[PDB]
Design an enzyme around this catalytic site. Structure first.
Site, short mmCIF file in Angstrom:
data_model
loop_
_atom_site.label_atom_id
_atom_site.label_comp_id
_atom_site.label_asym_id
_atom_site.label_seq_id
_atom_site.Cartn_x
_atom_site.Cartn_y
_atom_site.Cartn_z
N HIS A 216 36.08 32.45 38.88
CA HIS A 216 37.24 32.69 39.55
C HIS A 216 37.60 31.83 40.85
O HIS A 216 38.35 31.87 41.28
CB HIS A 216 38.01 33.01 38.48
N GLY B 165 43.09 41.39 45.50
CA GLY B 165 41.95 41.44 46.49
C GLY B 165 40.48 42.53 45.98
O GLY B 165 39.42 42.59 46.56
N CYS C 114 39.18 42.08 42.97
CA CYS C 114 38.33 41.45 42.77
C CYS C 114 36.87 40.96 42.65
O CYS C 114 35.99 41.09 43.88
CB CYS C 114 38.56 40.10 41.90
#
Ligand SMILES: [Cl-]
Ligand code: NA
Lengths: 306, 301
Positions: free
Chosen positions: B41, B143, B145
């Site tokens: 993503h 942030g 991920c």
């Protein structure tokens, strides 16, 4: 969101852990530049533990009586000296993995990460606090002596603890990296005992602010308190006194949440009176006291979940 | 002695964390050999995330759409592909700090260490469990991920989790390193929710053994039980069924402490039915279920 006991990434300290052997005794040392730091009781034999004279024990040692092993590499000891309760072994090789570092002595209530090590090899990392009675509630087995505690705010490792011994209640005592014990403890196996411990009030308040930041307010109430009335109540539950310094330290969290410090104190007084009635706060059914105000700001969002 | 929630030393993983940027999105990647792994993503705009066609969004992208930064060094991306929900970026340089590693998909109830990272920089480490509902109770901000979870066996890192999203209750969902989600979750902004969770029974028993080893014995009693009877109690209290395999795994702790698993089950049965009576176990007022039998043995022995 979420809230965990969060340690610092341990790699910078992993690269400094070595094994120190003297006689039949092996424990951990910390290799920074060309010096290895370890507990001086590595030079004690069985008899020596009750009333060792470390000056007399140490003068009998040569450099080659100390075996230092860094992974598979034997490091050559070329000098030694004692500073308080820490032995400093000069070695012929500077540690190429030495991080930026400093030595700091901490105050009760402060937290740090511990890298538990055995035979110079790291086993695990966890968070600790210096208790008001100058012990830590660690997890240490035989052979863990010389494991260290540290923080790594802003890419610099601040070493604040070196592990020396276990007390009868199973809690732990040690020194700063200048070899000065925290608390009244001594590196002798004479009877010693941790004092009555108390709860770190300013940290409980910080953790209540963390709960509000993360979106939970159920424990607040309509009341306030004077600082003195708060302390008169809290001390009846064996909480440490809250000082004006503590109130000032909590200012930023108070500002972010809109909850005055003395209003959060009123909430804490009521939680001590009532319990949680089957609820939890940040996943705990007890009031947690090993997160500092600085820890909460480190971990939580700067934006409250209103 | 003592008993702490303990993470593995994170150094071997710290040397693998990088920053990956695509458009205005920055998150973390895992750099092993000459490949960087991150959530797919990263390629999505906020518009895209409502209904992304990852095939089409990716064929649109090219190597030059990705900026990979290892500390202060830019890694040159020379290829890109997708495996399930993970993006794979081939770089021109093999990570010289690559540890011995495997990709391993874990089972609910198993624990792992999380290295929480922001902008490619490790920030903290903590221990957590894969919940029965396939979420994790992490601690993550915007942030994070691409942060990963792992276990270590001797010198081999077993990577088991990559972080992708936060659910509305504040728990977290992600994938294994082959991009397969844990749990019935998808990487799109659609209505999603954690299912009702259950307590990991075999881990609670392990932690009761840890408490005994550490001198906490007040909950022990003269009684024993059977699997069938205990599992009727477990169902009542939304505890996972206890299986014969769980009993076998606890066998060592049973032998060491003299409390047969079904003996300890009788303690747990009573704690469920009656509560803790104002007492604590290993400094907790709740029954802790994020220590596995392996975790207890490792830390206590
Ligand atoms: Cl301090
Ligand atoms: Na029993």
């Amino acid at each position: 969101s979420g809230f965990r006991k969060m340690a610092f990434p341990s790699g910078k300290v992993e690269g400094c852990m070595v094994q120190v052997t003297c006689g039949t005794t092996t424990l951990n040392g910390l290799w920074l530049d060309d010096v290895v730091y370890c507990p001086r009781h590595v030079i004690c034999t069985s008899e020596d533990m009750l009333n060792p004279n470390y000056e007399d024990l140490l003068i009998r040692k040569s450099n080659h009586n100390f075996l230092v092993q860094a992974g598979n590499v034997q490091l050559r000891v070329i000098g030694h000296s004692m500073q308080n309760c820490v032995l400093k072994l000069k070695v012929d090789t500077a540690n190429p993995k030495t991080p930026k570092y400093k030595f700091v002595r901490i105050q009760p209530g402060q937290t740090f990460s511990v890298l538990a090590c055995y035979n110079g090899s790291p086993s695990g990392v966890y968070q600790c606090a210096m208790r008001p009675n100058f012990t830590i509630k660690g997890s240490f087995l035989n052979g863990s002596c010389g494991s260290v505690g540290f923080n790594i705010d802003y890419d610099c490792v601040s070493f604040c603890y070196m592990h020396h011994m276990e007390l009868p209640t199973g809690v732990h005592a040690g020194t700063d990296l200048e070899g000065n014990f925290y608390g009244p403890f001594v590196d002798r196996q004479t009877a010693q005992a941790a004092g009555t411990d108390t709860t770190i009030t300013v940290n409980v308040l910080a953790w209540l602010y963390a709960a509000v930041i993360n979106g939970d307010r159920w424990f607040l109430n309509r009341f306030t308190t004077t600082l003195n009335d708060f302390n008169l109540v809290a001390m009846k539950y064996n909480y440490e006194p809250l000082t004006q310094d503590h109130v000032d330290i909590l200012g930023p969290l108070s500002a972010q949440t809109g909850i005055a410090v003395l209003d959060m104190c009123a909430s804490l007084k009521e939680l001590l009176q009532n319990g949680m009635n089957g609820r939890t706060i940040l996943g705990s059914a007890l009031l947690e006291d090993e997160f500092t105000p600085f820890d909460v700001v480190r971990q939580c969002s700067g934006v409250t979940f209103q």
